[PDB]
């Protein structure tokens, strides 16, 4: 069975599902989403899979619970997809906190329809 | 009167946001000039869908009747993205036409600047 390829919205929503699920289950594996040019800010940005992994591990994600309230995802430059996420996130069984998170997904360039995260920008509302 | 080093993505983002919200207050009828044929735009509403291209974006902006806007930009972060673009994340408060001050979350993608994507949501329509 063949079906037309996913829209940017489906791509974005599916990525969001993958990302937050992995953040709960095995945050030590999150680094697979990133490449050498990737930028992560969760505060100076850190770059590349190695440094991003280090930053993710330093946050001590444990039993991370996420409720996504809205996802916007749109085609952007050079076949990328820009994603805006609004939701609530909990870590270490503390209270849920509202956040927004902006992603830019970019074609990975070696596999059809495969994307990596070129930009990952997260901010809690309470800190702002 | 000199040649300055190219501004970092953060200065580009911050300066763009300044110009955008100033214009939103001074002349919203001119906001459409930021956008091109492949540009996406959404500005909250009930969630309302985005529109594409300068003509449809202008119509949308006009329909929103921006007037006597008060904007408080609490945070702006901006980073280099694909093909020397800049992705901007904005958090702040916006009051239109002397109505309620409402918290918003916004994302721009700027391309070498014009606006490729403008995603704005009010928190109170989502949370």
Numbering used by the authors:
A (entry chain A): 1 to 42, 52 to 137
B (entry chain B): 0 to 45, 51 to 116, 124 to 138
Task: Quote the passages of the study that discuss this structure, keeping the authors' original sentences.
Ras GTPase Activating Protein SH3 Domain Binding Protein (G3BP), a 52 kDa protein highly overexpressed in various cancer tumors, has in the last couple of years proved to be a significant cancer marker protein and a potential drug target. In addition to the PxxP motifs, G3BP also contains glutamine- and glycine rich regions, an RNA recognition motif (RRM) and an N-terminal NTF2-like domain ranging from residue 11–134 in human G3BP1.
The 3.3 Å crystal structure of G3BP1 was solved in space group P6322 with one molecule in the asymmetric unit whereas two molecules describe the 1.6 Å structure in space group P212121. In addition to chain A and B, 289 water molecules and one glycerol molecule were included in the model. Chain A and chain B are almost identical with rmsd of 0.453. The difference in resolution and space group between G3BP1 1–139 and 11–139 can be assigned to crystal packing effects largely caused by the N-terminal residues. In the G3BP1 1–139 structure, residues 1–4 are accommodated in a hydrophobic ridge between αI and βII of a symmetry related molecule as shown in Figure 2. The N-terminal residues are held in place by burying methionine residues 1 and 3 in the hydrophobic ridge. Despite being a probable crystal artifact, the binding of the N-terminal residues to a symmetry related molecule could indicate a possible ligand binding site. Although it remains to be experimentally validated, we speculate that the G3BP1 interaction partner, Caprin-1, might be recognized at this site.
